[PDB]
Design a protein around this nucleic acid. Sequence first.
RNA 1: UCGAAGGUCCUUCGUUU
RNA 2: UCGAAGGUCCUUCGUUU
Length: 260
Amino acid sequence: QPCYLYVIGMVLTTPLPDELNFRRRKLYPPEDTTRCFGILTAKPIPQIPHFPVYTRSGEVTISIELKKSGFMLSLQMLELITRLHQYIFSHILRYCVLPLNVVSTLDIDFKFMEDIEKSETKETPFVFKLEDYQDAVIIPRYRNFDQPHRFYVADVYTDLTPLSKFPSPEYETFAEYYKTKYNLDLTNLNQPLLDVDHTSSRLNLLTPRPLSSAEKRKAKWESLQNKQILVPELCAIHPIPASLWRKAVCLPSILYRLHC
RNA sequence: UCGAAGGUCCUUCGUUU
RNA sequence: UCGAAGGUCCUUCGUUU
């Protein structure tokens, strides 16, 4: 069985021009990170011209490039990749797609699978490690247990602490809000707080980067969602880093282009 | 994100002697 | 006339910190 291994090139050719960025938000170039995604096929791919996807950070050019050709490796490895492809499309999102990393040539990511398979308290308190949350996706443990919500860590607010003033009038402090509503007590009252961002699955080929009722309401919801400030002790860190996650959310748009 | 309700129209069927 | 089952779209609301 002949195999063909493609890499999905992501390079930011047109960053926000810095006139267009009024708010001077951080830019997240895809080329700054070595971990990417590839497509695995049986029959090769009919050459596709390179195309843009429009993200918050700018115009990102997608190039489908052939990294390796003609090989094949076992069956169990062929079967394992499928579990990652599912994981990407079922658990992360909602012929084969797999993670790659640098060795200056590219191979299948060795550190991907065991973060997840690494994931199978307390009286002495939660400890805040700044390097944990640097590139991170966090989920709140205290709500939405069915389908947990996930956020990028946008900022670490260092002057803020769980005893800082809660933004809404009904509560004095974050400590109080979480105690009152969720019955949660914090073991660490000196920890900073986290700013978040969220995007997930939409179409990136055009630039939203006449609304109905159901959509005008999600506009407000998404808006408030991004203004949320979260508590690190009350949040779990997702194994897949935010940097790889940002590449992952372009996959539906990119795979759409290859089909059409 | 997950839900709730009101309305509107369409499809399929029941209902009379 | 009164109903059943399924769907479409519009509108209103809850849900986050």
